[PDB]
Amino acid sequence: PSWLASALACVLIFTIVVDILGNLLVILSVYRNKKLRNAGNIFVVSLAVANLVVAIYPYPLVLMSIFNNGWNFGYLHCQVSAFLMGLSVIGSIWNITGIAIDRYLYICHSLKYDKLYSSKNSLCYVLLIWLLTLAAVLPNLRAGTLQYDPRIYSCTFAQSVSSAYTIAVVVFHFLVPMIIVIFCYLRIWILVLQVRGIDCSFWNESYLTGSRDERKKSLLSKFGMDEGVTFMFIGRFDRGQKGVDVLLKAIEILSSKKEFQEMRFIIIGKGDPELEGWARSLEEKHGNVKVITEMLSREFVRELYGSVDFVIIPSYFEPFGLVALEAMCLGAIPIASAVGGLRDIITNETGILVKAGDPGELANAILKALELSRSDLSKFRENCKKRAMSFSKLKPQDFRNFVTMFVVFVLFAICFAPLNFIGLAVASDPASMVPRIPEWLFVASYYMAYFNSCLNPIIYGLLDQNFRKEYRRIIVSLCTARVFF
Ligand SMILES: COc1ccc2[nH]c(I)c(CCNC(C)=O)c2c1
What we know:
The structure is a monomer. It is built from 20 helices and 8 strands. The protein is α/β, with parallel strands linked by helices. The protein folds into 2 domains: 2-197 and 397-477, Rhopdopsin 7-helix transmembrane proteins (Up-down Bundle); 205-391, 3-Layer(aba) Sandwich (Rossmann fold). Strands 5-4-3-6-7-8 form a 6-stranded parallel β-sheet, sandwiched between helices. β6 (310-313), α12 and β7 (333-337) form a beta-alpha-beta unit. α1 packs across α19 (455-463), α1 crosses α20 (465-477) and α4 packs across α16 (400-428). It is elongated. The structure holds N-[2-(2-iodo-5-methoxy-1H-indol-3-yl)ethyl]acetamide. Residues 82, 85-86, 89, 136-137, 140, 156-157, 159, 169-170, 419-420, 423, 449 line the site of N-[2-(2-iodo-5-methoxy-1H-indol-3-yl)ethyl]acetamide (ML2). It is found in: Cell membrane. Keywords: Cell membrane, Disulfide bond, G-protein coupled receptor, Glycoprotein, Membrane, Receptor, Transducer, Transmembrane, Transmembrane helix. It is a multi-pass membrane protein.
């Protein structure tokens, strides 16, 4: 009805006004604030420009086309209006991809180096982003995918002209960036949780008294076995989670080797009685193996981490694995599975990594660890400690900027996901699926994606305190005249 046409005009009127003033404030704030003037925020200004180009020329033409109830301008006006929209939408999705990579590299650099991360090639990377967006929107002028759609009163990329062109745009410029940005922030969150999880006030070798060699000889004598290269496991007894079974099968491979005599194994945990029986059987057939099913105190586990030479983490799935970080804390060299989180916290210099769910590979890794002499081990324990020491280093940091940039992405994905879903549905059969798709649904998905062009400055002020403070500073400085005497 008549109200629905005027309602869509309100959305555009709001979007145009909020995008012009809002993104002008974002660009002005980055150069008027020292805390927001960092090089890593070149991508924010790049996105702010991308957001602004639609409200100066394409959107005003569309607003007038609602009232006109048709395209009363030229074909060149329809082609340029469409070409600049693509440069904007594809520009903003690849700019969000840029920030996602920048911030993931930031947390990794601050972990590895004492010096602050300085994105030197930032002005270079944005010039490649705009080269990539121009390479994607230009072929639509020659193909003729850009045409006027009366339902949405605009000149855009028609999903029903060429189905090969639409699936390529949906896969390469929506699904490809989405997976890159989702992975980037997923890896950041785990590392922020690992930073939170660790406790250097508890897992500190100050709490331990004597020499490592003395504390080991003492711990081994208590378990009724002489001195040797000791190994430890602390986890639940399960088939496919903590991987206690991979360790037990690997001990059987080693039991025949002459090298097994110079080994000690301290398995700790409860679970499957079948796995509990198998472990108790290897405890009876060999004096090297000691199994502890009972509940152990945080204090005695710290004592264990401190005396034991190696900690085996044969986990199948382990997202955080604070266990390895806690072991490295008190200089225990880990022999862990290459799992997401375990692969993050264990560098090739701070432990020996093995392929998960392989009893043969673990046996060869335990044999590799056995060949390491007292001198070679001392540097590993030093590196393990320096690795755990760099995780607790990032504890007082203000991780609020990551949240804002994440909300930026989350909202973008909400606005465009309906539009890109329709794109694939139309691509399947452009002839039949066009009348088969609801009219309200097509209009709403389009004006949702249009509304996104004004959403970025709103959240910048709402979530990032530095932007809110500078927004007010600009608003006052532009509207508080100077008087004399
Ligand atoms: C590829 O060249 C262009 C040119 C102009 C455009 N205006 C819009 I909105 C888009 C996104 C189109 N996405 C879907 C799912 O239909 C676009 C793309």
